[PDB]
Amino acid sequence: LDVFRRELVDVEGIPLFWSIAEHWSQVESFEARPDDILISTYPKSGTTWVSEILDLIYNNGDAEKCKRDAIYKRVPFMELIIPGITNGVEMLNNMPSPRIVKTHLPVQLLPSSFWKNDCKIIYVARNAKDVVVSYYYFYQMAKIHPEPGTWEEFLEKFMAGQVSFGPWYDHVKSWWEKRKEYRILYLFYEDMKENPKCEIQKILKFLEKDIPEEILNKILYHSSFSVMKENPSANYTTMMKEEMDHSVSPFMRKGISGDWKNQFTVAQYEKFEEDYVKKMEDSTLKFRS
Numbered sequence: 070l071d072v073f074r075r076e077l078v079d080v081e082g083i084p085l086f087w088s089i090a091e092h093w094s095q096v097e098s099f100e101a102r103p104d105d106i107l108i109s110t111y112p113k114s115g116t117t118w119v120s121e122i123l124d125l126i127y128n129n130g131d132a133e134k135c136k137r138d139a140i141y142k143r144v145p146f147m148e149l150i151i152p153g154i155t156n157g158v159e160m161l162n163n164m165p166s167p168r169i170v171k172t173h174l175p176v177q178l179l180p181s182s183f184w185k186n187d188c189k190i191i192y193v194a195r196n197a198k199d200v201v202v203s204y205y206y207f208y209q210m211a212k213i214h215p216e217p218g219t220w221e222e223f224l225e226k227f228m229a230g231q232v233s234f235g236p237w238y239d240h241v242k243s244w245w246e247k248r249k250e251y252r253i254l255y256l257f258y259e260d261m262k263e264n265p266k267c268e269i270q271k272i273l274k275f276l277e278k279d280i281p282e283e284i285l286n287k288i289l290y291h292s293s294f295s296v297m298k299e300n301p302s303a304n305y306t307t308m309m310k311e312e313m314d315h316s317v318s319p320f321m322r323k324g325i326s327g328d329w330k331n332q333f334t335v336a337q338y339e340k341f342e343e344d345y346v347k348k349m350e351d352s353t354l355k356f357r358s
């Protein structure tokens with residue numbers, strides 16, 4: 070299918086995949102349900118990690134139940150519609166409750182039904198420098214994206230917000246502000262790295278679930294990077310090479326915090342930081358790198 074490497078298309082101010090734009094009315098009119106849990110992230114911030122955690126919670130840590138299908142079918146990417154390939158809206162329409170829904174939409178573009186249904190939302194943020202590195206390699210392997218160009222070209226596009234789903238800065242800031250209006254558990258990738266048990270406990274409390282320590286430990290074990298990277302139900306290796314080419318860069322790439330040090334030159338770092346401070350000083354958000 071000839072659907073790959075196209076230029077992004079503006080949707081309500083945000084660069085999105087051409088086929089999402091083409092099917093935007095279907096996304097806008099998406100029907101949420103009161104018990105939907107929405108996982109909302111800027112790309113490359115821990116979406117798959119948290120989605121697997123949620124599905125594990127819903128299945129009481131049962132690893133085999135969580136291998137019933139690929140993560141992208143268990144937890145549909147709502148707005149992702151590609152002709153001949155996938156339709157997240159239709160996948161969700163046909164899914165029995167309680168649904169786990171994935172989105173990367175900026176808050177201003179989220180289908181209004183989520184607000185009307187007052188859904189609980191788990192937002193995951195990750196430090197910008199690690200995000201852009203992860204996103205660079207992902208652009209290379211995940212062929213729906215436009216060509217990223219060189220690292221320096223891609224870094225500049227990221228800083229300018231000229232990448233799929235728009236600027237990281239506005240995404241994280243506006244979702245942070247939204248936590249005052251709706252029930253949003255706002256998590257950080259770095260915290261999940263440092264103390265995953267603590268973060269899963271936060272998720273459980275938010276979900277109003279109390280589970281045995283033994284089940285919590287099962288969920289912890291199966292959501293580690295070393296397990297997920299080898300799990301074909303979670304590591305995107307069931308995608309066609311034409312869609313995601315693992316040989317270019319694996320989806321489960323490094324799974325650390327601080328990979329930015331391996332990618333950024335000192336000059337790129339200093340420039341990025343100067344720009345970052347200007348963009349983020351209006352926000353009470355604080356990150357670790």
Ligand SMILES: Nc1ncnc2c1ncn2[C@@H]1O[C@H](COP(=O)(O)O)[C@@H](OP(=O)(O)O)[C@H]1O
Nearest residue numbers: 113114115116117118203293294321322323324
């Ligand atoms: N269980 C886990 N623990 C830590 N990182 C994980 C993880 N599962 C996936 N990741 C990392 O999360 C990033 C992908 O995020 P998303 O799911 O939002 O696209 C990748 O980062 P890297 O490219 O830095 O390795 C990936 O390796």
Ligand SMILES: O=[N+]([O-])c1ccc(O)cc1
Nearest residue numbers: 141146149154155213312
């Ligand atoms: O075809 N693809 O590249 C896809 C399809 C589904 C999905 O959730 C993500 C990517």
Ligand SMILES: O=[N+]([O-])c1ccc(O)cc1
Nearest residue numbers: 112116146211212213214
């Ligand atoms: O383009 N893609 O195939 C994607 C993009 C984002 C994402 O979270 C998963 C797949």
